[PDB]
């Protein structure tokens, strides 16, 4: 009934060529939630991104997909959160997670950026504050660390993308439960999900 989230951010690189790359996994969640709740995101240059507002279980949720470079995502998040009086702890940032496999997603409060450019910039622009929530969308990882950038800026193969899309769908269902039943119940459900 009570839950801490006022702003959901889906991290992304802008433009059609990057739309289905792994590094946009967070945006897929916001895109799907907005589609299901009939909200049209508006390009607001003041917030360096696409924005919207929806009501879920009588709770107001703002959404944001930045149009910055991924490594400047914090500009958009800070601009919007500061305008609407939203604290870091009331923000949930959905992002691709190298440390989880395709088909899995997890909620997390706080933590490091894990080398994610978007998360690193968000921490900085929020005043070196790590304590925002994350929705970690597993994308798996390459064999060698020097190939990570090429991997996340790549498109998953079709079967792998099926797994990703299944986790995006369950993530969206659990964000709905978050707003209705709260964080613990949302997390309990999400963390038992594995796409097969």
From Swiss-Prot:
The record marks 96 as: Stabilizes the basic form of H active site to accept a proton. The record marks 13 as: Discriminates between blocked and unblocked aminoacyl-tRNA. The keyword Cell inner membrane does not apply. It catalyses: an N-acyl-L-alpha-aminoacyl-tRNA + H2O = an N-acyl-L-amino acid + a tRNA + H(+). One of its GO terms (molecular function) is peptidyl-tRNA hydrolase activity. Disulfide bonds: none annotated. Monomer. This is Peptidyl-tRNA hydrolase. It comes from Vibrio cholerae serotype O1 (strain ATCC 39315 / El Tor Inaba N16961).
């Amino acid at each position: 009934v009570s839950q801490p989230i006022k702003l959901l951010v889906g991290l992304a690189n802008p433009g059609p060529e990057y739309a289905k790359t792994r590094h946009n996994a967070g945006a897929w969640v916001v895109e799907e939630l907005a589609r299901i709740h009939n909200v049209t995101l508006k390009n607001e240059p003041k917030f360096f991104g696409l924005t919207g507002r929806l009501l879920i279980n009588s709770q107001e949720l703002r959404v944001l997909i930045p149009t910055t470079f991924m490594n400047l995502s914090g500009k958009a998040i800070a601009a919007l959160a500061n305008f609407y009086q939203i604290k870091p702890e009331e923000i949930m940032v959905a992002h691709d997670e190298l440390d989880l496999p395709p088909g899995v997603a997890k909620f997390k409060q706080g933590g490091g950026h894990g080398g994610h450019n978007g998360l690193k910039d968000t921490i900085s622009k929020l005043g070196n504050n790590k304590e925002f929530y994350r929705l970690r969308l597993g994308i798996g990882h390459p064999g060698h660390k020097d190939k990570v950038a090429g991997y996340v800026l790549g498109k998953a193969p079709a079967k792998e993308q099926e797994c990703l899309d299944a986790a995006v769908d369950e993530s969206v269902r659990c964000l709905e439960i978050l707003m209705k039943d709260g964080l613990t119940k949302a997390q309990n459900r999400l963390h038992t999900f594995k796409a097969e």
